[PDB]
Each structure stands twice: as structure tokens, then as C-alpha cells.
């Protein structure tokens, strides 16, 4: 979704703490003012990228205290109050996998990780208790067991299939979710698409630092 | 009038317990705005109204009336 | 009622545009970025880049060629690098515009020429229609959407036992206003008496979870008795 | 940004609704999806 909001300064990178060098750099016009603008432009939209993905619900819905969802079990994806950062069980698994003095700094993201989890709970809490109705207008509640009947109609399967097979379907769903936990807990390569983004930015930044050791 | 935040040291802004929408983003979940004699304030921004859904396994809400709305979407 | 709501909704667009300048920010930023980028290119001519003067004629008018040739080389290197920076910025920026142009073409096809089932692609709500409007270096879409407004709490049931058999709705849900059971649509409360023409049969009472007791009125019975 | 735009599209048409687009929301006939956050990204659980 987004990448690191880095910020670089010329006057400490090209001419770090030198009056003679700094005065010479001014003969190159507005290159750094142009460069510091380009990096700022990137940094700003990195907050837009997160904003478009998650900030799609105007209200923070939350599930009822009673988890009677017709036999389906969401306890592995709903929030966990036992953590100071109220993240679900699966979210905890994902965060445990993905891992100077020269004018190079990193800006903090505008949406803190606690706020990101709060948005996904609202999106998740809406889905179970209101179906697709919370997307269009106001959330209109409907029993989850009935919600699936109209999800089945959407794929051309008559709704009587769900009700007559409700325990079988619910048990298959619960096992399918359980397999996700087993997959994540053992296979590190599952998160390669996100680790490569982190690695590319760190690798690019280290090359910039090494360039200071060159004579040119 | 010094407020320590996770994005740095913010000087000149009156820290407020309340939570509003973001006006001028600072970082780490803190935004600032100019409002009430008037001064710049800093606060933890809010994500929206808190609203639980009255879920139950034999209760459905069905709309009885509707509204036609027109929105504007602008693209370069 | 629907026609009057549409006419008022369009009227509000005029009031919104006539007062709020920020509405067109997505197009003003494109104009501003290109003017801002071009002015930087022009300002670069005033830089020395290490030469004795930013004016090319002053080097020629004051130095004889064997010396001027080195001083000019500094201006050529600096000014040539400036153009490469500008062109690179435009190539990346032009790619950003094309993606929007491709998106605008997609909306035109799937929102004006037809009707979308894609959620929030054509405005928030159940999409009805869109109308294109031109703008300077862009396009403006007016999306007409259906939004449910007022709701009531009804008691529901997934199926109904009448004669030992489970009856399910053909279209819509079963609802009760507290005492009587009806079948009604999804997105507009419109009660109907449960008949053999509203429902279909499958199985018996013993397998579905939450079935209730009622009668499914048979319209044929009074026609043969009379 | 292209991935961020794609992620926003899936959120709207996969979580908030139900897709008839083939293989857009997981392989099979789509029922529902659930978002999960991740460091610098989003994870979708597609139920098919
Ligand atoms: C579904 O919602 C609709 C609105 O979202 C409801 O329509 C509204 O119904 C009420 C009551 O019948 C009307 O209010 C009355 O209107 C009359 C005459 O209206 C005239 O004046 C208004 C105000 O300028 C104007 O907008 C109209 O076009 C008429 O020229 C007044 O004399 C009364 O004092 C009272 O205000 C609303 O006008 C009407 N709105 C619209 C847009 O038509 C509808 O009743 C709801 N349906 C159900 C089943 O609940
Ligand atoms: C739930 O809906 C049912 C179906 O409409 C309601 O039953 C109906 O209640 C009305 C109001 O009492 C009855 O109207 C009366 O009809 C008699 C003729 O039978 C007339 O002489 C009276 O002046 C009055 O208009 C209606 O007959 C009755 N329908 C049936 C089939 O019995 C019920 O009241 C609703 N319950 C709630 C809590 O809203
Ligand atoms: C909907 O209506 C049907 C029929 O009116 C209800 O089924 C009836 O349920 C009662 C008790 O659950 C049955 O009584 C039992 O009868 C057996 C002998 O058949 C007796 O050994 C038991 O001690 C008890 O008295 C009754 O037979 C049964 N009727 C039929 C036709 O199956 C049903 O319970 C109603 N639905 C709900 C949700 O209550
Ligand atoms: C949903 O799944 C979780 C995960 O297994 C269940 O939590 C288990 O609950 C049983 C009995 O309550 C315990 O013996 C297990 O140790 C729990 N496991 C974990 C990982 O906490 C939960 O019970 C399931 N939902 C329901 C309604 O039973
Ligand atoms: C608003 O927030 C301030 C902190 O920014 C609160 O002041 C703290 O109050 C607690 C009492 O619970 C004290 O232990 C702290 O020492 C106070 N902070 C400082 C810096 O002294 C204040 O109580 C909050 N008020 C409201 C109404 O929320
Ligand atoms: C449907 O019923 C529920 C509960 O009976 C209503 O939700 C309650 O609304 C009152 C005020 O309207 C609140 O004080 C309660 O806290 C709500 N309870 C819950 C569990 O949320 C709901 O408003 C009703 N729907 C309509 C359209 O009237
Ligand atoms: C809907 O959920 C409620 C949750 O309370 C169910 O009510 C309970 O049902 C069990 C057996 O199904 C009884 O032992 C409890 O005494 C019931 N509780 C109350 C307060 O009545 C209800 O049965 C569910 N609906 C259906 C159709 O099963």
C-alpha cells in the first residue's frame, strides 16, 4: 500500500557543515529546492495511499458482545482486547514477519498503526452485522446465517442449499480460517511482496550513503 | 506552550484532550488546526463517529423510503 | 417524488460549485505543477554553474576564444543537465496523467454508456446513471445513485413450515410486524401475503435452523371451491 | 501507487460488496472477503 516516507537534505549531504562548499553549491541554482520538493511530493501521497484503502467507512462500527453468528467463528480476525494495540490474532502474525547522521531522516506516517487496526475492525465489524448494506448507505442489520443465503444467490446457487447445509458450511469455513494461521506461522516467504518493498528502500538508501566514500 | 509528540517537539500549539478530524497533518496521529481568543491547537485526530449495530439473529432492518443523490467525481 | 428529488439534487451541484473554489483542486494542481516546473527551468538560466557570468554574451564579449571555451563548457553542462531533469519530471508526471485518463475512459464506458454493479466505482450507493461534463484538462461526472433512507425493525425467519414442508422466499425476505408474517423485497419495505406464488418448497421442517410456523395461503383453493 | 489504487478497488468491490469479476477476488465463485492490516500493506482473506 505505501512505503517509507524518507526525507533527504542537500546542504548536509553534498556540503555537510562546510562554509566554503556551501557557498559554491549556490552556483548551481535551485537544484536542492527542486529535489526537496520532489521527495516531499512522494511523502505526502504515501499518506493518501493509506487513506484511500482504509478510510472508506465514515463510522466505526463494532460487533455485539454476543458472538452468535450462526455457527461461524471470527475470533481469529476480530480485535483482541488483551493487547495494548488492539490487533486481531492473524494481524499479530503478520506484524511479526515483516522487518543517519548525513541529513537522512525518516518521517513518521500520519495514520498510526493503532488507527489502521481500528479501520480494519470497522470494515470487518460492518461486514458481519450488516452485509453489503453499510457500503451504500446506513448499516442495516441482518442475521449472518441469512446473509450467506443471499451471497449464495449471487453465484446462482439456490438459498435452500445453505440452510440445509448450514453446519457443514460453517465447519468448513472455521477450518479454512484455521489453516491460514498454520500457513503464516511456518512459511516466511508468504509476505515476500511486502518484504521486497522494505528491502528495496533500505538497499537504495545504503547506496546513497556509500557514495560519500568516493573520490569522484 | 510545549507539546511533545512522536513526530517531534511542537512549540506554540495548545494541546487539547478532544479529538476532531484532521486539518493540518503533523504525523503519528496528531493534527493541528486554528480554532477557539483563537489559537493553534494540537490533538489526536478522530476516525469518525462510534456506532454499534443492533445485531441479533432474528432481526432485520429494511428501508421504507429512499433518497436520490447526485455526486461529483472530478478526474484529470 | 423521484423526479423532484433529482431536480433538487442537480440544483445543489450549482450551489456547491458557485461558492467552493477547492472543488476543482484535482485539476488546478495539474496546471500549477506544470507552470511551477517550467518556471524552475527558466530560472536556471540565471545561474553561473561555476562560470564567471550567467550571460553567455558577456563571456564572448570579454574573453578571446581559448579562454571562453572553458567558461562556456561550464554553462553547457549545467544547462544541459537542467533540461534532462525537466524532461524526466515530465515523463513520470505524464505517466500519472495517463493512468487517470485510462480511468476516466473506463468510467465513461461503464458508468455513462451502461450501469455498474461495481461498488463505489460510480458514486456511493446503488448506481443508476452518470452524466459527463467537460472541464479544463479533465472530465467531471455527475453520478446519480439510490440510497436507502428510512428503516424499521422487523422480526425475520429463514423459512416457514406450513404442512411439514419448508417454504423459502423466491425473491426477498420473510418479515413480521409482530403478529403476522409477510414476504417483502430487499431494499423497500412492501409487505405481501405469503402464497404459493411467492415461495418454493424444499425438504421438511427438521433440518433448517430457525424455521417458524405459519400458513402459506393457496390462491387456487377458493377458486375450485366456488 | 498503482498497487494502492488496486488495493482500494478490492476493498470497495470485495469487502463492501460481492464481485462477479472472475479471479478478481480469489479463485472460485466469490462470497466475501475480510481485510487485515500488515506493515505497509493490506492482506485480504477471500472466501470462495
Ligand atoms: C419519503 O421521503 C420523502 C422526502 O425524503 C417524503 O416526501 C416529503 O413528504 C412530506 C410530507 O408529505 C413533505 O412535507 C410537506 O410538504 C408540503 C408541501 O410541500 C411543498 O413545499 C416543500 C417545501 O418547499 C417543497 O419541497 C415541495 O416540493 C412542495 O412544493 C408542505 O405544505 C408541508 O408543510 C410539509 O412540509 C415534503 O415536501 C416531501 N418531500 C419531497 C421532496 O417531496 C415522503 O413523504 C416519504 N415517504 C414516506 C412513505 O414516508
Ligand atoms: C401487522 O399487520 C397486520 C396486517 O395488516 C395487521 O392486522 C390488521 O390490523 C388492522 C388494524 O387493526 C386491521 O384493520 C381493521 O380492519 C377491520 C376489518 O377487518 C376494520 O373494520 C377496522 O376498521 C380496521 O381497519 C386489519 O383488519 C388487520 N388485518 C388482519 C388480516 O387481521 C396488524 O395489526 C399489524 N400489527 C402491527 C403491530 O402493526
Ligand atoms: C409447528 O406446528 C407443528 C404442528 O402443529 C408442531 O409440531 C408439534 O410439536 C409437538 C411438540 O413439539 C408435538 O407433540 C408431541 O407429540 C408426540 C406424538 O406425536 C408426543 O409423543 C409428544 O409427547 C408431544 O406431545 C406434535 O406431535 C407436533 N405435531 C406435528 C404435526 O408434528 C411444531 O412444534 C410447531 N413449531 C414450533 C416451532 O413449535
Ligand atoms: C473460535 O476458535 C477459537 C480458536 O480455537 C476458539 O478458542 C478456543 O476455545 C476453546 C474452548 O473455549 C479452548 O479450549 C481453546 O484453547 C481456544 N483456542 C484458542 C486458540 O484460544 C473459540 O472457542 C471458537 N469459538 C467458539 C464459539 O467456540
Ligand atoms: C486532559 O489531558 C491532560 C494530559 O494531557 C490530563 O492531565 C493529566 O491528568 C492526570 C489525572 O488523570 C494526571 O495524573 C496528569 O499528571 C495530568 N497531566 C499533567 C501533564 O499534569 C487531564 O486530566 C485531561 N483532562 C480531561 C478532561 O480529559
Ligand atoms: C432496532 O432495535 C434496536 C434495539 O431494540 C435499537 O437500538 C437501540 O436504540 C436505542 C435508541 O434508539 C439505543 O438507546 C440503544 O442503545 C440501541 N441498542 C443497541 C443494541 O444498539 C434500534 O435503534 C432499532 N432500530 C430502529 C430503526 O429503530
Ligand atoms: C437466536 O439467538 C438466541 C440467543 O439467546 C437464542 O435464544 C436461546 O436459544 C437457546 C437454544 O437455542 C435457549 O437455550 C436459550 O434459552 C435462548 N435464550 C433466550 C434468552 O431465549 C435463539 O434460540 C436463537 N434463534 C434461533 C432461531 O435459534
UniProtKB/Swiss-Prot annotation, chain D:
It comes from the Viruses. This is Spike protein S2'. The gene is S. Subunit of the fusion protein that is processed upon entry into the host cell. Mediates fusion of the virion and cellular membranes by functioning as a class I viral fusion protein. Contains a viral fusion peptide that is unmasked after S2 cleavage. This cleavage can occur at the cell membrane by host TMPRSS2 or during endocytosis by host CSTL. In either case, this triggers an extensive and irreversible conformational change that leads to fusion of the viral envelope with the cellular cytoplasmic membrane, releasing viral genomic RNA into the host cell cytoplasm. Disulfide bonds join 14-25.
